[PDB]
């Protein structure tokens, strides 16, 4: 009822029945005037299984697109189904076999078995739901989906082509696609007396060969009925065939991000090998391109487009432990830190890179969470995690006297200038303790 | 004349007539030496109908690409047509079936009936016009145009396939593609005596089969005349067949559909397996991405394309009526509201989410467009659309005592904390009215 | 000799001969043991025309990739050709027909006629040169090029398939692809006695049908020789066939910039029609997207990558007349203007847009070349072409008191702040006359 | 063991052996009930050769994806193989032809010879490895891999096509695809007595024809066994056929080749038809774009991907030897030269161009890497590589008296005017040496 685990099992159970009922119906329609007593029980179970699905759907939840909620009211639940393809489900569930024999073996009633072909859309829904899964490769599930539609449309065409051969009396077998078919020493002289699986394989062989446009021509349309359907089936399959090529081509042009990385990566080797060499230069631009792959991370970050309330929770969950441990904010109010943790952006620096230089104006505040940095003036001070630098450039407005270089791979948190003062002027009281902590540490002697 | 509704129905009625005359001219050219008396009245109606269109084109409008304006001057409209494809239309309107019989049943005269094939271009122009429709994708329209062209070219090829078999005398029937045909028991010994809809179906079966490159070989080009045209038709079809595949791929490449959702979930996964985020926050963000692809996302659109000057007008058209109904802005000046409206941003909240909590300071002001919310302290107050919340934290600088939870999907307009004080500081008198309205309600 | 107009005519003349010699050689190879006396003269003219090309190439210029120059020295000119496919040109020019009859009608000598198939590469070069032309649509010339390669490979395969039928004696005609071919009432009983154009059309019909993978099967490979070539030809054509589909697909996915504009353009109507309406709003975002198309112009500009010396000449040719007419630079040295004209970037503003506001810091200098602007404080001053505004924000460092609005479509030249002072401090003398001109105009009263 | 050159030749010699055993196993399975004595020595060599490879794999290296390091420990290498596809290789090495004859000529035993088809994966691994090569495009390698796979699958299908005809007794030859075959005069009445290379060619002709979906129909699936496998092979081929088309398009889409030049000439044309630029400047820029696509452009590359710290190292590796040889920097400190080297930019000049003119002030400093230039005042001085020019205007602030024209294509390093004074102002002592060097030369 809430679409729990039990309902999901049923949707998998009916999906198996949907695969059977969609495949068996054209075989029943074309190759069988009336099902033998052996298959009487098999169809009874199939209709009963779908009949139970009709009752279960009356108890299923209701998913409405505009409001995005699970509404449990029964009156609204029934209403939706009745307008939305409930007659077709009842019509496909009716015993069209029993009515066919009861009515007097009238073939126009048996044309109504083809409404059970709607049950293949249930399998199509399962393929669409499989596409929504992140784990399953998109190219794989868009190939199986279009190799099942091609297979199903081929199975249906194979069963209707045989039916068009049975639309004539047995005296006119020579004017059919099968009664006039001789393959090797075998002659399909009386095709209605041949066993079922020879007729189906011969029909399915013709449809598959037509489906891939191989077209041997050993089996071909002879009648005017068969020619018209062949034109209809070929024209439809040609559009369907171009869709399979188009979908597979589109999923290869839209290659994985790893291959897009390789395109840029291999091109840069083309740019150095024709110009220079080096065990270190070649091994350092590779590091730089893997750092561009690490930035492919910060871009997801920027996109985000999640409400700021959740994004604030992301900022609070990750960066709050690191910010609270810095000596800069010793004694500061937790609220002031809360407005701080929101506005940092994560930037990664490779070992050997130069963060700062001597006497250069600073536009960003940096906090260290991972790795070791060096302040070179000789290493003035080795930077540990939770140790911030560049505070002199912000509070004092004097450029950093010491150049900053990266010794090990670092996860550095970036804070912008104009953002920082905006918080500072709003919380002027919190500004004093920041300066008081700086006074205690000394090493600056500037205010 | 002015491209009014009648002229938009005239060019829609000729399109119906053009479809008939495009699909009947090859049928008349191939399978008919002379039209029967019964079909005489039908074709004479179509030829007359296209004659009226010729007259109406002289009176319609004149569109010039350079000026992008319709010049209604009669002399300007006339000169254009006679220079641009008017002789072809006049030639097509000639009673070429009547002239055929009057000239002495000369097949050379009947060869020129094929100029009526230009009327498919009128159908093509409709497909090009349908490309301009915003509702229907311009790449799905090209799919239908090539499907129709392949359907039309196959139909034209089928009628020329049969005509080449009629170019030989009946004594040389065995040297044709249809005269030597024997499908099953049926033998096309004297095909000229066979009924029309069996010859066309056989010819169209041959044309359709090679159009998809199936090539059964039951029907093939026996004669040297048919071999050449089969090569020409196949070669042209091969180019046209690859055009459909190219346009099919371009449709899938452009209309990524769920690929735009699959790729976003891949980047979001990377951002969220490197951070060890808990399952509770795991579900919240993922559900938002699920919502962003079901109803197709508007913030993305607005960014996608505007400067600030008219982005305010977009905000003014969309957000002003809801902001004006807020009790907080009761008695406030229009300019104060107008400048506020510019800076709103829209956020959608899935049901079950929590916006604020107990004793939590928030830096955003929220106005609800749709949905129903509830203040939880028990439900303190159910929030109606146009009932703002969050003013307590923004103005009084005290965290919200209650949590505003979501039970109905809501469209929420966001105004930042820092932006709001700047508006209050400038429009200080308007801020005083806000305080008075807050005092009246509390 | 300098590759003048006369040489270009010859390259078009030999191209006609290349089309003939490439098409006629397989027809000569397969369908002819020895050319009749009627075609004796025709081949003599063909070889003579290519023989003259051998001498002319010894006099043509020399294009070397590394140095990009036309070197006229004869000794270097002949050297290049001799190593680069001169033997093949001589070999294809030799009278292999006359040698074939002279040697004693030996068929192994006639296998050497196929080196004249290299002459189709001359046509391929003309197709590659056509691609370099800007005017010709790229999709068109990449379709004709791959429809000529397919046509040529089909013409060649049609002429070699017939040859494989003649490799057997006439007594074994029944074991060939043509001697055992009956189509309708016509029987190819003695195919060597049939007229040439029936044999070629039958062979070319088979190759075209195989080329498009239609495969009727009326004409098929019977011998072991014909089967092996059919496998070789089909496998090669399958790769070639997928290249034609791939090239046509790639040139449709890479659509024109107009269609890319339409994709963004149509999407924005989807974003307003579902939200709001308006005769003006809808008609103003269209203006904004056509302004984004006008910026597609400034992006070409930014790319540029032309040496700065030429780009300086572009700046001097266009913006110098407009800059000299401004009252701001009255009496300034031409050299100072020369360093000015380089650094402006062209930006376009639509009517109704807001350029400036009251009391806002300015980061760019603007000059007006086209259109009319309004200074609203009421219109303080209507701006004409060659009238600059924002000078107060630069020289005085006071924000513009008047908002700037666009009345008519304007071509506005943009100058950056830090760039302008850099020139000002370098030419301090030129700074005085700029301030003196500002003093004369008054309307500012600030320095 | 260490993935040395011998092991890189061993895995290149087995690849030769793998190609033989991948293409001979279906041939042995289909057309051979039992191998003749002559081919016994050939196959016993291949099976022995693959047995040595099994032993060598235990002694080779062990590559782990997580650590990206080669673990040379013998026990670590052993455990990996036996768990990962070792039983298949051992099973393939079994003398399945000898066991077939010894067991009593049971076709069920011979059915398991098809596990030797796994050796194509070794060939596939080589194609995947060849994708990593920078010289050969990774998308052109995928083209060859699918061409080989289609060639291999067609070869495998041909041998299974013939095998299904041998599953029927010789009395039921007419019910097979080959027994009922009659091509021209030749009748495949008793195909088992036909020579090997006529049966394989007939089988491969059938397999090749349907691989490209040509489908002549001269050879087709007569039996029910062949109908099923034809459907299976055709269905698998249809997926594989569209894979080649998809990879063909991706190659053309990615390798735009001249499209990168056509698109640039289109944007440059727009920038230059809206400006009424003269023909003389028209040719100069167009020729530069022609040069930019002939030798493939390096400035574009460097931008494409570097930070500043190692972009200096790229400049230091490439430009330092040429800068150090400049007579202007004679006696200058290394640090002064090192900081200069960072700020050079490269410009290529087509022959015939003019760089400066009479009395023209320029703001760039030029060092020539390649080519030959000439100062025109008559040629004042022919410029050799490593001979800088433009110092007169940069230092003395006087426009160049002479024009430096280009007669040889030159690679020119550019240093800006404003950048150079900042270097001179900081390294003032180095600037004095520059003045002394200028005085010595003049
Ligand atoms: C999924 C792909 C194959 C699933 C087959 C399911 C059909 C089924 O069970 O009914 C068999 C029935 C017949 O069973 P029967 O009861 O006539 O024996 O239907 C078919 O014949 C389906 C054949 C499908 C072949 C194409 C693959
Ligand atoms: C592109 C098409 C250009 C066709 C040019 C053919 C060259 C020629 O002289 O053909 C006649 C000669 C023979 O003419 P003939 O001299 O034997 O008479 O060559 C051919 O037959 C070429 C046939 C090409 C048909 C394919 C198109």
Curated annotation (Swiss-Prot), chains B, D:
- The answer on whether this UniProt entry bears the keyword Transport reads yes
Q: Gene for this protein? A: SKOR
Q: Which domain of life is it from?
A: Eukaryota
Instruction: Tell me the part of the parent protein that is shown.
Output: 76 to 524 of 828
Q: What does this protein do?
A: Highly selective outward-rectifying potassium channel. Involved in potassium release into the xylem sap toward the shoots. Assuming opened or closed conformations in response to the voltage difference across the membrane, the channel is activated by depolarization. The voltage-dependence of the channel is abolished by internal or external acidification. May interact with the cytoskeleton or with regulatory proteins.
Q: Where in the cell is it found?
A: Membrane
As for family, the record states: Belongs to the potassium channel family. Plant (TC 1.A.1.4) subfamily.
**GO terms for CC?**
monoatomic ion channel complex
List positions binding a nucleoside 3',5'-cyclic phosphate. 328-441
User: Chief localization class?
Assistant: membrane
Alphabetically, the GO molecular function entries are: outward rectifier potassium channel activity
Taken from the UniProt entry and renumbered to this chain, the residue ranges that sit inside the bilayer without traversing it are 202-221
UniProt GO BP: potassium ion homeostasis; potassium ion transport
UniProt miscellaneous comment:
Loss-of-function mutation skor-1 leads to a reduced shoot potassium content.
Please indicate the ranges of residues that lie on the Cytoplasmic side. 61-83, 132-145
Q: In which tissues is it expressed?
A: Expressed in root pericycle and xylem parenchyma, and in flower at a lower level.
Q: What is this protein called?
A: Potassium channel SKOR
State the UniProt keywords alphabetically: ANK repeat, Ion channel, Ion transport, Membrane, Potassium, Potassium channel, Potassium transport, Repeat, Transmembrane, Transmembrane helix, Transport, Voltage-gated channel
Where, in residue ranges, is this chain on the Extracellular side? 33-39, 105-110, 167-201, 222-225
What is stated about domains? The segment S4 is probably the voltage-sensor and is characterized by a series of positively charged amino acids. The pore-forming region H5 is enclosed by the transmembrane segments S5 and S6 in the Shaker-type (1P/6TM) and contains the GYGD signature motif which seems to be involved in potassium selectivity.
Any stretches that span the bilayer, and where are they?
12-32, 40-60, 84-104, 111-131, 146-166, 226-246
What does the subunit section of this Swiss-Prot or TrEMBL entry state? Answer: The potassium channel is probably composed of a homo- or heterotetrameric complex of pore-forming subunits.
What do we know about what induces or represses this protein's expression? Answer: In roots, strongly inhibited by 2,4-dichlorophenoxyacetic acid (2,4-D), abscisic acid (ABA) and benzyladenine (BA) treatment or by potassium starvation.
């Amino acid at each position: 009822h809430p679409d729990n685990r039990w309902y999901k099992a049923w949707t998998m159970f009916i999906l198996i029945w949907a695969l059977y009922s969609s495949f068996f119906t054209p075989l029943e329609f074309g190759f069988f005037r009336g099902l033998p007593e052996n298959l009487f029980i098999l169809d009874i179970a199939g209709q009963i299984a779908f009949l139970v699905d009709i009752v279960l759907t009356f108890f299923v939840a209701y998913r409405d697109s505009r409001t995005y909620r699970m509404i449990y009211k029964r009156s609204s639940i029934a209403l939706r189904y009745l307008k939305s393809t409930f007659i077709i489900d009842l019509l496909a569930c009716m015993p069209w076999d029993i009515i066919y024999k009861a009515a007097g073996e009238k073939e126009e009633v048996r044309y109504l078995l083809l409404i059970r072909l709607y049950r293949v859309h249930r399998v199509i829904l399962f393929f669409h739901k499989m596409e929504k899964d992140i784990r399953i490769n998109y190219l794989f599930t868009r190939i199986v989906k279009l190799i099942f539609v091609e297979l199903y449309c081929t199975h249906t065409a194979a069963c209707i082509f045989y039916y068009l051969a049975t639309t004539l009396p047995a005296s006119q077998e020579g004017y059919t696609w099968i009664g006039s078919l001789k393959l090797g020493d075998y002659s399909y002289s009386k095709f209605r007396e041949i066993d079922l699986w020879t007729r189906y394989t011969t029909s399915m062989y013709f449809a598959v060969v037509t489906m891939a446009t191989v077209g041997y021509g050993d089996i071909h349309a002879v009648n005017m009925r068969e020619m018209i359907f062949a034109m209809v089936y070929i024209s439809f399959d040609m559009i369907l065939g171009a869709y399979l090529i188009g979908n597979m081509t589109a999923l290869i042009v839209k290659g994985s991000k790893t291959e897009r990385f390789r395109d840029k990566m291999a091109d840069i080797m083309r740019y150095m090998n024709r110009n220079k060499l080096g065990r270190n230069i070649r091994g350092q631009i590779t590091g730089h391109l893997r750092l561009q792959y690490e930035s492919s991370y910060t871009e997801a970050a920027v996109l985000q487009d999640i409400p700021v309330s959740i994004r604030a929770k992301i900022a609070q969950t990750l960066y709050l432990p690191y910010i609270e441990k810095v000596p800069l904010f010793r004694g500061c109010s937790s609220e002031f830190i809360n407005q701080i943790v929101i506005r940092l952006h994560e930037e990664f620096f490779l070992p050997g890179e130069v963060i700062m230089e001597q006497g250069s104006v600073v536009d960003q505040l940096y906090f260290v969470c991972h790795g070791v940095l060096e302040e070179i003036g000789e290493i003035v001070a080795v930077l540990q995690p939770d140790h911030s630098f560049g505070e002199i450039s912000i509070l004092c407005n004097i450029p950093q006297p010491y150049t900053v270089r990266v010794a090990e791979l670092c996860r550095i948190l970036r804070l912008d200038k104009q953002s920082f003062m905006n918080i500072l002027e709003i919380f002027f009281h919190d500004g004093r303790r920041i300066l008081n902590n700086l006074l205690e540490g000394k090493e600056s002697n500037v205010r």
